[model samples]
Target: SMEQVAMELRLTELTRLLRSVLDQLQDKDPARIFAQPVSLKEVPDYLDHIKHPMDFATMRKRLEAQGYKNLHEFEEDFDLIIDNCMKYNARDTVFYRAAVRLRDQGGVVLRQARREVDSIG
Candidate 1:
C-alpha cells in the first residue's frame, strides 16, 4: 500500500500548493505570470492522450452524475479514480506512467511558484 499512500500524500500536498498559488495570484494585481486561473479542462489535454477512446466530456458527465459539483472537487476525485484504475489494470501501464509524469510536472510548477513568491516578497 506504499504506492497508494504516496499517491494520496502527493495529491494532497500538490493540491494545497496549487491552491496557495491560486490565492496568491488572486491577491496580487496587474496580471503577472501566475495570475491566470487553473482550469481542470487543461488536465486531460496536457497529459498524454488516453488510447482507449475515453472522452473528457463523458468523464466529466460521470463525475457530475456522481454528485461532484465543482470542477476542482471533480478533478481530485478523478485523479484518485485514475490511480486506482491504473493499480487494478496492469494493461494500462502507458496511461499510468503518463499520469505519474504529469503529477511530477505539476509538483515542479508548484515549486517554481513558491520560489517566485519568495523572491518577490
Candidate 2:
C-alpha cells in the first residue's frame, strides 16, 4: 500500500511538473514551434549533439560509450509523453483522465514490487 501510494504521488508530481514546464514554454513561444520534428527516441540523442550534430554512427558510438546496453529499452522508460493537454490545447478533463491511467499503471507496478519485497522479508 505504501509503494502504491508513493507511486501515485510520484505520478501526480510528474504531471504537475510537466504542466508547469509547458506553461513556461507557451509563455516564451505561443506557437510552440520546434525547429526539428524530434522523435521521442531522439530527444536524448539530440541533447548529446547540441554542440555539434553527430552522424548516426557517431551517435551510436556515443550511446555505447555511455554504457547503454539497450538504448531502445532506455528510450521506452525515459520518453516523455508530450500530450496536447499539457500544452493547454486539450481539455483538463482529458488530462486528468490520462493522469489517472498513469497513476493506476504505476500502482500496479508498485503493488507487484511490494509483494516481492514482502515475500523476501
Candidate 3:
C-alpha cells in the first residue's frame, strides 16, 4: 500500500517527461517520432501504426544525458501506476510525496524537474 503510493511519482513524472521529450524530438524529425502524419481515418482501425525511426546513436546519447537506465524498471513502474491511478485517495498522497522528492533534489535540475512535476500534477 505505502509502496504503491511511493510509485505514483514514478508515473506522472515519467509521463510528462516523455511527453515533453517526445514533443521535442518530434519537432526535430517527424519520421523518428511519428510513424505517419496525423490523419484521421474515416474509420480508425486496430491496424494503425506509428513508427519510431530515430537514429540509434543519437537515441543512446540522449538517453544517457537524460540519466537513462535499462528498460526493465519501466514495466514494473508502469504496473504500479496502473494499480494506483485507479484509487482516488492515493492521488494526492502521491503528489505530496513527489513534493518531498522535489524538495530533496538540488539546483537547476531540481527546479526544472519541479516545473515538470507541476506540469502534470
Best by lDDT: 1
Which residue pairs collide, candidate 1?
A: none
Better of 1 and 3 by lDDT: 1
Q: Model 3: residues >4 Å from true position, as ranges?
A: 30-121
Question: On residues 9-119, what C-alpha lDDT tens digit does candidate 3 reach at each position?
Answer: 565456546445434433443233122322336324312432322232434344435433322332233223223223322445743343233223322343464466557
1-121: candidate 2 lDDT, tens digit per residue: 9998976665554444333332333333223232123444845554443333322233334333443323233223222322322332244565435534543444444354445434643
Clashes of each: 0, 0, 1
Error of 2 at 42 (Å): 28
What would the TM-score be for candidate 3 when compared with the true structure? 0.29
lDDT of 1 by residue, 26-103 (tens): 233222222222233864452343333222344444433443333355345435534543543355575455445544
Model 3 worst lDDT window (10 residues): 46-55
Give candidate 2 regions above 4 Å deviation.
Answer: 31-121
